Amino acid sequence: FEHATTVPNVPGIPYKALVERAGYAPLNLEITVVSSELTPSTNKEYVTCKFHTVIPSPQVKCCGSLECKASSKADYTCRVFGGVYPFMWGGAQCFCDSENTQLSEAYVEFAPDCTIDHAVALKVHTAALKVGLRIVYGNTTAHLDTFVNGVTPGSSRDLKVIAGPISAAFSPFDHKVVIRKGLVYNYDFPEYGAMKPGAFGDIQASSLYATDIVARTDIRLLKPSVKNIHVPYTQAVSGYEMWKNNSGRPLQETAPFGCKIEVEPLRASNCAYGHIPISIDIPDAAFVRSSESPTILEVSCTVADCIYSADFGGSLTLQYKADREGHCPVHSHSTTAVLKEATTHVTATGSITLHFSTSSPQANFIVSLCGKKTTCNAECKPPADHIIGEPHKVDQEFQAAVSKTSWNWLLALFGGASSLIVVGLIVLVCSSMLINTRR
């Protein structure tokens, strides 16, 4: 019916479990994390890029004065100068010798090539986890996606899978993130409406085509000096360019746990951390009555050789006897040894070779062939290959991580160190009562 399990969150390594009911033949269970996604809820703050200053044509009045006006353009700046007497190709352009007033303006706008080279500032909330499993039971295979929250019944057809809450909540993104051309950076951008010149976000707008651009780039207008018409000015360096030069390295290369950052929507894929408490409701159709399944009269296991390598660096064989033929499941009732095969044909008497893997220097686990638990023991040597290109299939234990001989040595030493004290104690007490009874 219902089975509770705890599959490690590693994308690709299978997990084998054995579920059974009284009067029903045991059924193999296979759980795999095919792919995982970590999609956090995002809110767009503004859009920034490299500004392009616009200097409109100057306005001058021959004999008069001009008053600076107020405009809604970003970083608008206006100045008025008292005596200019400007020149162009053709000579002087006004008759007053010193009553010439010139008006200068300068605002900023989005560069024409900002539709491709532009960054987006985002704020990210709590991250949610969604995975796609490949549950296998009996002779059937199922694929499904579910949300790891503990309440969502993500089920393909009738699997009724309920993935419990993740053991540890982890999120590679800090509160504020910046996206640019598919590269995700962890940056602390200034909040909307508070722009510091010469830094990131010196110009911002709700959208690239928004008409309410706001910016603060520290535009300064200067007094003209040359005779011909001019609008001298000086400005801070483009903060977007500065940030691009000092970007650092992206989350695609900084994020931990082997996460693969990808965008549209922003998410982290195939992260490896923690455990998932799944719960499966297997339909009764898959289960088969124990009477129909063949029974094993006896079974003895012998193991050829073993190395506790990450891959399936182990071998095993067993003799068996049965009164029928069919398919039986094989399972290893240990947390430090995983078989490769789930089921295997059986024909009366014979022998089957099964490959396994372990991370302990002892193949001292229990193997069952549709029941009939059997004990194996071997002499597991360390592996030769220093480096392999495949993740470890079993988490390293401790109680099993120590060799039998070392366990024996430590046990004998501690036993002697605990026995001599007690024997001294008892002889002391017997002599003490002897002395008390002396008089």
Partner 1 sequence: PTVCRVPLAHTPTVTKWFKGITLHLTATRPTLLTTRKLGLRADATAEWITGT
Q: Compute the least distance from the CB of residue 136 to partner 1, in Å.
A: 27
Which CB atom, from 182 or from 265, has the smaller least distance to partner 1? 182
Residue 60 has which token pair?
């001058």
User: Least distance in Å: CB of 170 to partner 1?
Assistant: 9
220 beta partners: 234
- Rounded to the nearest whole angstrom, what is the least distance from the CB of residue 255 to partner 1 in the complex? 7
User: At closest approach, how far in Å is the CB of 283 from partner 1?
Assistant: 38
Q: Which is nearer to partner 1, 212 or 385 (CB)?
A: 385
Nearer to partner 1 among residue 70 and residue 116 (C-beta) = 116
- Cβ closer to partner 1: 83 or 258? 258
**Residues linked to residue 215 through DSSP beta bridges, in sequence order:** 203
Distance of CA 231 to the CA centre of its chain: 54
- Is the CB of 386 or the CB of 438 nearer to partner 1? 386
Site for partner 1, rule CB under 8 A: 116, 249, 253-258, 272-273, 385-387
Instruction: Quote the least distance from Cβ 223 to partner 1, whole Å.
Output: 46
What is the rounded CA–CA span in Å between residue 338 and residue 247? 45
**120 vs 162, beta carbon nearer partner 1:** 120
417 class by beta-carbon count within 10 Å (0-12 exposed, 13-18 middle, 19+ buried): exposed
CB of 272 to partner 1, least distance (A): 7
Nearest residue to 16 via CA among 25, 26, 24: 26
> What distance in Å separates the CA atoms of residue 47 and residue 213, rounded to the nearest whole number?
10
User: What are the structure tokens assigned to 382, written together?
Assistant: 């360390």
Query: CA quadruple 15, 16, 21, 22: dihedral positive or negative?
Result: negative
CA distance 45 to 121: 6
Length of the chain: 439
Q: How far is the CB of 256 from partner 1 (least distance, A)?
A: 4
The nearest distance, CB 217 to partner 1, in angstroms, is 29
Kind plus residue range of the DSSP H or E element containing 10: none
Choice between 384 and 428, CB closer to partner 1: 384
E strands in 235-392: 260-262, 267-269, 275-276, 279-281, 296-302, 315-322, 325-332, 337-339, 343-347, 350-358, 366-369, 374-375
- Closer to partner 1 at the Cβ: 69 or 181? 181
